[PDB]
């Protein structure tokens, strides 16, 4: 018996009424399915979506415990193994989700088999074990028949590209996506429509439309119950506001730290966000990070260290950056770092020219400001916003 | 840098 | 009896060397093949080429009249008639073109049925009888099964985002293209991969890497023997050449023009190129379409008034285009000619503007040469090129 | 404006 049953078992013991208050939840027609679910050992909900609403409703504080029992449980066969999947990889449950995929890639069902392998591709290139190249061609070689896993297949591509900061081929790539063609399964619809929202307020960003941007983040918060969406909804309804309005900037990432502080991961991406934008305003900064070496705090310690007139320990944390190799958006804030140090023009040339390269017409703001403020004409730097 | 994600 | 038959028979009458010189033009092991065309009624070559070879080797002056007959004699149903749509429609044989789509669409053959109504969306999107939206939709419905309708349903919205100035979406599109997939007929394949060098070599020019735009139309060159690529190809990269070399942007428009004379249409295009560098050179201008009111065509009057000081007269063109309806490209160019006229940063700006949104990186250089005129930051206008 | 084909 699974921790969710003896759970629910227990309450439903203390409580009758739970039965029609999770049945309601779990949005069925009336409470058969539950009593099912509750009484017969694999037995599962026709909508994934079921188990989750309930576990978030009754049990808030214990999902991760109670999900990673429920799901490790499952058989990998059916569609509710496929759709908890999709639920680790959206919560980056990578525990969950490496031991579904390896059970999945050697499976006798063909539709578990596919999801285990496409999303296998995912994991190994988001942790660089294999270049994009390996990964297209991997993908090429399964010849895909589902839906979902064309959409996912497209979608692990957008998350590749967002994170090596190669913006250019994102707005077109997630046109492609059709999500009304996925029919069986309405947890995957509904999640992939999620990240979907996410993705596009992230392009939205990257093209400087920030009131659209601030729509699809709004869309991804009222579609979903999933902290890593929410979580990047507020990070990127903050970012937008990075220039704007430092208030309301501060208010989105501190809302989005304020429901996240337990994850660690979420806790630091919050941390960068608030480093991020107190070096834009120039203001003391209490969230610099000491112990890391990666390229994005060092430049933050630089940055800081600049608006400071502290140029000497600026200087020494800029030499250990140049050091390290850059993809061409870190090299572009590398460059406004060195601008801004040696008062150089050169430098916020140089800027310019790989924010254009990353295709970031959002940060490319950076060295404009500075441009600006050195008398540069006005008009011909608004049209470098384009 | 500014971290992004989604 | 196809009037191909007949002219063959009484050549191979005046002179028997013919058969083998026919034979190996044709691509063929040995002449049976031949003999076998020659006597029996629809018997058709393996490949379409083999016909077309021959009648280009042997009749050059009558490739029209000749494959007319012969492409309007074919039973609809088999791997010729498909092979002659593309032949149709890649030489802009109309007449032929849509009496084998009419057709087409009615006949029993599935393959037949599904080339029939792809290449009439084509016909319908690019004489603006639909919109790409029903176009998008109406291929959607089909559930296209072949690799070559698949290609060319991409193809075909290509040259749509070509004519309507609409050159974001280009490059990703025809990545999407694999012409590896077309295994039974290598016409089509053929061909289509000369239209994909050309489309690549548009797309290049567009994004400004013009050796690689030349690289791509000199691969259409040599994979080709019909005229309207080579036109083509002779057109991009002229137009390439149209900010850095004179001389031999006209030449490569007069080597077009050539070849090319004597259809209306390709002789129009060319006076067109011509006229338009004439025009950037502010050269005296031979080449101007004085009876015409098309926005092109009235851009260029314009153009070239102001090159010699007419203003009124410059004024009075620019008039006429304020009245008609432009695209962003095209507006782009009406900014330039305001600019020109008026002397007037403000326009030049604009023009920047409408280019941007018409993602064209080349003709861009226009607003932005003016500028640099003006004594404006020479180093943010290089930046406006990226 | 500049012909442009394929």
Same mark, same amino acid.
Do not use: R, T, Y
């Given at each position: 018996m699974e921790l969710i049953r003896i759970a629910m078992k227990k309450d439903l013991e203390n409580d009758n009424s739970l039965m029609n208050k999770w049945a309601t939840v779990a949005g069925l027609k009336n409470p058969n399915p539950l009593y099912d679910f509750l009484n017969h050992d694999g037995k599962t909900f026709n909508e994934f979506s079921s188990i989750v609403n309930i576990v978030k409703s009754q049990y808030p504080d214990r999902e991760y415990e109670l999900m990673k029992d429920y799901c490790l449980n499952? !058989?990998? +066969?059916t569609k509710a193994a496929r759709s908890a999947l999709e639920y680790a990889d959206a919560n980056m449950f990578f525990e969950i989700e490496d031991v579904l995929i390896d059970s999945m890639?050697?499976? =006798? #069902?063909m539709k578990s088999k596919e999801y285990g392998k496409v999303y296998k591709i995912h994991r190994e290139l988001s942790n660089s074990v294999i270049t994009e190249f390996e990964a297209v061609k991997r993908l090429g070689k399964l010849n895909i028949k589902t839906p979902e896993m064309n959409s996912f297949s497209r979608l692990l591509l957008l998350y590749h590209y967002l994170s090596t900061g190669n913006? =250019?081929?994102m707005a077109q790539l997630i046109k492609? /996506? !059709?999500? =009304? *063609? /996925? =029919? *069986? #399964?309405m947890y995957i619809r509904n999640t992939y429509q999620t990240r979907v929202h996410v993705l596009m307020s992230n392009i939205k960003l990257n093209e400087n439309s920030l009131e659209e941007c601030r729509e699809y983040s709004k869309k991804a918060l009222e579609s979903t119950n999933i902290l890593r969406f929410q979580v990047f909804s507020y990070l990127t309804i903050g970012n937008s506001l990075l220039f704007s309005n430092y208030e309301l900037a501060q208010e989105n990432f501190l809302k989005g730290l304020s429901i996240s502080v337990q994850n660690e991961n979420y806790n630091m991406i919050f941390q960068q966000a608030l480093c991020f934008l107190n070096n834009v305003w120039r203001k003391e900064n209490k969230? /610099? #990070? &000491?112990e890391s070496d990666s390229i994005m705090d060092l430049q933050e310690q630089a940055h800081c260290f600049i608006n400071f007139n502290e140029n000497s320990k600026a200087k020494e944390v800029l030499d250990k950056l140049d050091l390290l190799v850059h993809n061409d958006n870190e090299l572009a804030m590398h460059y406004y770092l060195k601008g801004r140090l040696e008062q150089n023009k050169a430098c916020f040339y140089s800027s310019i020219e790989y924010f254009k390269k990353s295709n !970031? +017409? &959002?940060? /490319?703001r950076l060295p404009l400001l500075e441009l600006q403020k050195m008398g540069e004409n006005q008009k011909l730097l608004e049209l470098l916003l384009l | 840098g500014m971290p992004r994600g989604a």
């Open positions: 499952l !058989d990998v +066969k890639i050697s499976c =006798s #069902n913006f =250019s081929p492609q /996506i !059709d999500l =009304s *063609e /996925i =029919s *069986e #399964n969230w /610099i #990070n &000491f !970031d +017409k &959002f940060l /490319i | -």
